Design a protein around this ligand. Structure first.
Ligand SMILES: NC(=O)c1ccc[n+]([C@@H]2O[C@H](COP(=O)([O-])OP(=O)(O)OC[C@H]3O[C@@H](n4cnc5c(N)ncnc54)[C@H](O)[C@@H]3O)[C@@H](O)[C@H]2O)c1
Ligand SMILES: NC(=O)c1ccc[n+]([C@@H]2O[C@H](COP(=O)([O-])OP(=O)(O)OC[C@H]3O[C@@H](n4cnc5c(N)ncnc54)[C@H](O)[C@@H]3O)[C@@H](O)[C@H]2O)c1
Ligand SMILES: NC(=O)c1ccc[n+]([C@@H]2O[C@H](COP(=O)([O-])OP(=O)(O)OC[C@H]3O[C@@H](n4cnc5c(N)ncnc54)[C@H](O)[C@@H]3O)[C@@H](O)[C@H]2O)c1
Ligand SMILES: [Mg+2]
Ligand SMILES: [Mg+2]
Lengths: 242, 241, 235, 207
């Protein structure tokens, strides 16, 4: 369990991030949600998680494309929740196109959110975690942080950058009660159609779910994973095995 | 929880294997212990786990150096336990020496146990798991299954082979409710301790059988249904640099 | 030999880049040098290679921290040299500090040059190489593009990013007579902490490696990394 | 010395090394025929090379067989064979070449693994496993010879459209390309290239 602990999950207003925030809340961790979408639906999710799990849940609408806003999210989490034990850097965006046709604006945006926000979040969290003698940085990368796919140059580059940054984070904090790891998901979600689309990269022909990724984050945040650091955990149904 | 499931752990009469068997027993899984040791000591361990965790625990001392003995362990597990949901290939041995001075005897011994045993054990279990529509093969490799160190060629070669074998197992079982992964541990066990770990383990802290047991429990969980054909490094940063 | 071929090497005014530009010139390739340092020395180098190897050697001092400038380097290279067969993205900088103490300005500068310049240069070169039906993109990453070291977050992240970008480049050009690879050097001048051989890597060796990747013997070597680190990544 | 150089890649590498002016010692089924499936023969072919050739500077372990079948149907017979040659031979060959090279103060061990020494494919458990084994063995060899003038590396080839599934380049790799690669690895430019792999797979492992 994670009672008494505080977890900040970027881009948790929906999808994978919400699945992770939910799983952590279910372990008794207080949560700080983040991301965009419909404000009423967001408040419903925030209020609902707090009630369903008996934990404190706040919403911070910080725009992660801005370095200072990312750092502010972490520092405010500490001010309001009293500490920060788990930081899940999850928010990300995508754009497909040949390298020569890839807009510089899109390249910069993907690098800023998918990679630099990991830097800014981590930088702000580390001083608190070191003083706490406890920390868990969980970066949601991708199978594309380990291998490549055509037409996703910026995304692949940024995700590879995250895996490398994660390793450095682990080395700088080794032995200080802090670990840093990167979860690398395969595809996340007519049955014939689905299996056909997954056939290309995902051998299991099964989609990875937000609940499964949430369970993986919960494991990394547990004491059993105290010595799991600077590594990647592939949840890709065999994507990278071949 | 793993109530109603049966887990076979090779080389579990002590150390890491026992740590894994214990964590699995704590989740409610019936256990099949394996390995060598003192009859009384082993029985104390076996009876103790069964009583403490309220599950059935069998002990099979099959010598895993022989391929038929390995498959026999699995068959005997299904025969006596009724099924096999989880197989943890853990048994292993080591021998240090330069390549030109590495006894061929030792080379063949390390490969037979550290690698071929995984093949034999896996072959025997798959038929049952495929029929059940569920299975978890957890191979305990090592950091040396990903990187290397001087004077341990057979060990490193075997461990690498295990990683490769794990991926194939995963590919052949994809989507059939069966996963296969390899846990790659770093140093497993104050100033001296740190000095000894300083060379390979950044954390300067040992990995524990309990932690590896918790890692096996995670891999056997439903949250890990889509984690297959990969490695989980529990090395305190060993492989990050 | 690379007679009739044009190679552009970023950051070739010294160290590794110069070692690679030189090695490629010795193979008959025309060269476009780039980078900073002393102007008089740069001219001596440029004229010296052209005369000593009998090839056209040009100098373009484009500041590669600027995307448009990188694209301009390649386009002007096609204008003045007539073609571009080899693109060696080598230019890079470094900064060391704990992540929490790492200046945002340094993180941005390292990503801009060490990673984004590889994108801009590749983006500009591809249209030409595809039309030509030939191309060789060689990115100089680092052992830090495969593993990490404490206090070098921006550098390690950027190098890893380069390794990944190289893989995508290879896949988008697969089979079009174009290959994209990354050379990952170890230390280049206690060396025992990272490099087992206890021997530094040299610009000459790296140059020789670039020549091979540029040769036809490596026509099917693409989307991979070639470690020249004396055992760094082995352990 | 180039094992399994009686044809295919082994011959391609053998050839390429010839065009460079290095005395060659062929093998398979000077010339030798030692059965590499026997650690006895393998170790012999090496020492027999330094005997009749005067010395050994480049050892290329290329011998290897294949067999496909689900793991549970994979004959223990085949498994042991694929392992015996595809992997154990590299240990025997290398074990017999090190004392010589170390004394010579120079050496180039070139193991011919496969893309299957880095990734895997269904129904090739024994081959994939021995290949990964080669990669690991190659790395240990380097660490034990680091700074002694000897390097150990592994070439991991792809297919040598029916390759659409594994090779995006959709083009086969050739024995000469592999030969040139071997030539390069033997080059003085590869003095610091040790303990690593070189993938020649048209982008196989990149995705
Ligand atoms: N979808 C997949 O199958 C898949 C594959 C593996 C890796 N990934 C990675 O998983 C993570 C989650 O992806 P997802 O599929 O749940 O996506 P999603 O779009 O469902 O969720 C992204 C979240 O990011 C937030 N966000 C975006 N830009 C932001 C900004 N500037 N500031 C603050 N918040 C911002 C959104 O509000 C949203 O809640 C991403 O990092 C992605 O790259 C996803
Ligand atoms: N301890 C470490 O630091 C470390 C590092 C990473 C990897 N490893 C791996 O961890 C695993 C467990 O090692 P450990 O350190 O717990 O050692 P251990 O000696 O404590 O346990 C090994 C077990 O294997 C059993 N065994 C040995 N030969 C056998 C045979 N022929 N048949 C059946 N059982 C046999 C023994 O009876 C024993 O219970 C091994 O696979 C090892 O390679 C250990
Ligand atoms: N030990 C090592 O030296 C080592 C380790 C492995 C990787 N690396 C990488 O090798 C590559 C070559 O660097 P080096 O070690 O020869 O160092 P160097 O400083 O001698 O060479 C770097 C070159 O980059 C050029 N440069 C810098 N900023 C530029 C800009 N804005 N625009 C255009 N050119 C610019 C310089 O003028 C110089 O010629 C770098 O990418 C570096 O990160 C070096
Ligand atoms: Mg792959
Ligand atoms: Mg290492």
């Amino acid at each position: 369990m994670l009672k008494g602990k505080v977890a900040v999950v970027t881009g948790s207003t929906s999808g994978i991030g919400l699945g992770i925030a939910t799983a952590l809340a279910a372990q008794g961790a207080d949560i700080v949600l983040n991301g965009f979408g419909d404000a009423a639906e967001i408040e419903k999710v925030r209020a609902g998680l707090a009630a369903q799990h008996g934990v404190k849940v706040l919403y911070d609408g910080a725009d992660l494309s801005k370095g200072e806003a990312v750092r502010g999210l972490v520092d405010n989490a500490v001010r309001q929740m009293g500490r920060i034990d788990i930081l899940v850097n999850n928010a990300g965006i995508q754009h497909t196109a040949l390298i020569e046709d890839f807009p510089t604006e899109k390249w910069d945006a993907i690098l800023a959110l998918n990679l630099s926000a990991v830097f800014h979040g981590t930088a702000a969290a580390l001083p608190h975690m070191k003083k706490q003698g406890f920390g868990r940085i969980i970066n949601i990368a991708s199978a594309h942080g380990l291998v490549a796919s055509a037409n996703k140059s910026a995304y692949v580059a940024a995700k590879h950058g995250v895996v490398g940054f994660t390793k450095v984070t682990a080395l700088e904090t080794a032995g200080q009660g802090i670990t840093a790891n990167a979860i690398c998901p395969g595809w996340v979600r007519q049955e014939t159609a689905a299996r056909e689309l997954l056939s290309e990269k995902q051998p299991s022909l099964q989609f990875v779910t937000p609940e499964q990724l949430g369970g993986t984050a919960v494991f990394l945040a547990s004491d059993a994973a105290a010595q799991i650091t600077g590594t990647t955990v592939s949840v890709d149904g065999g994507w990278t095995a071949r």
